[PDB]
């Protein structure tokens, strides 16, 4: 395989190119648990 | 295979190119659990 | 295969190019569970 | 005023949660010209 | 004013949570010209 | 004013949480010209 990817992404309180007065973010990730 | 991808994406409180007074975000991810 | 993708996407409280007074978002994802 | 926003947004070739073979996009913006 | 925002946003060839074979994007912005 | 923002944002060939085979992007910005 040219590219194999198993990705677990978590995003909270993300501002991209924005005019935001206040940002709050809480993120939790549990991945690849045996 | 040229590209194999197993992706689990979680987004909360995301502002993109926006004028937001206040942003709140809470995100949780559980992936690839055995 | 040129591109194989198994994607689980969750979005909550997303503002794109918007004028929003207040944004609330809660997202949870469970994927690829054995 | 609580929130005053003058926004000029341009989007071309945008794929959101989609399975697209090929995407082409050309965008131009002229804003707030004196 | 609590929040004053003059925003000029340009997006081309944007893929969000998508399985895309190929993405092409060309974006140009002219803003706040005197 | 609590927050004054004059923003000129340009995005091309942006992939967010996506499985993309190939991404091409060309972006140009001209802002705040006298």
Author numbering:
A (entry chain D), B (entry chain E), C (entry chain F), D (entry chain C), E (entry chain B), F (entry chain A): 42 to 75
Article, verbatim:
Here, we demonstrate that the low complexity N-terminal domains of both D10 and D2, as well as the full-length proteins, can form amyloid fibrils in vitro and in vivo. For D10 and D2, the central conserved VAV motif forms a beta-strand that is associated with the protofilament interface in all the structures we have observed, suggesting that it may be a critical element in fibril formation and may be expected to appear in ex vivo structures as well.
The first structure we obtained (polymorph-1, 2.31 Å resolution) revealed an ordered core formed by residues P42-G75 and containing two identical protofilaments (PFs) related by pseudo-21 helical screw symmetry. Each PF contains three beta-strands, extending from residues M45 to A53, V55-V57, and V64-A72. In the case of p.G66V, the PF2 or PF3 structures could potentially accommodate the mutation, but it would not be consistent with the PF1 structure and would therefore be expected to eliminate some of the possible WT PF folds.
